[PDB]
Design a protein around this nucleic acid. Sequence first.
DNA 1: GTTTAGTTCCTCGTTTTCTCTCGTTG
DNA 2: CCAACGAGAGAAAACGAGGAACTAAA
Length: 231
Amino acid sequence: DRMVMGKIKRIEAGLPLTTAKGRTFGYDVIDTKLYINEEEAKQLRLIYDIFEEEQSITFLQKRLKKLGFKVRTYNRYNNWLTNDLYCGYVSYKDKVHVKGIHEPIISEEQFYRVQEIFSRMGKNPNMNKESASLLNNLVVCSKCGLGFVHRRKDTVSRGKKYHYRYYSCKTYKHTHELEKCGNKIWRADKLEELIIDRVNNYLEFREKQLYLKSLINKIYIDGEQVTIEWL
DNA sequence: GTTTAGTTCCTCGTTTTCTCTCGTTG
DNA sequence: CCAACGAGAGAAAACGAGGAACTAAA
Ligand SMILES: [Zn+2]
């Protein structure tokens, strides 16, 4: 309206639209202009580094707590890790970007590497949960178009306790929303072993998990056929 | 004996929703 | 001085792959 005139004016001048204390972490504000704060800037470089390693905010919080840092709120770290203010840009409505006059803290190369970690995260729901299967979001139903889901079935039969794992199309799981498509339900241990052998011809657990997401796009299953779509 | 499926009701990192406040320019 | 918008904070709610325990067939 009439007050958008004032906010666009600062962007053309390379100035930030956020100068409030507590909302400009890593920067001191002097006469409405930003200047690095060595105490807080050192944490940001430390935060960006660890997030690349852990590729998770919660894992980032837990490691920072072991370094004496006070753990901020979750959304606090996400905003910090996705705000291009720290590689030297000022933006109106997060879609009109201009290089600011302030000194950046994070390299422009590192910033976008982080952004691809979040991008990959969004395409893989629950990938950072303790229970995420080895192939959490990699298996797709050929006959069905829907994604397979890991399933852990344990039973007590005649006193003895058994434990079994499976990968089944989501149609077998959500019976209130989806009709079964007649696609095979594979033993988890048998399919995982099959994927391993094939990946070999082309580390801890979560190291495996992520290593697969980097060199496989999606895995297709058509009955007994496993066709890996390499990335 | 050993497996393969169903159903109910929880797990929790992540995402999204929705107020509250700050403060610069008009 | 002052109002008003965009933006960061942030508690709550919603997400969704995956679980725990129990059951009956295969
Ligand atoms: Zn299907």
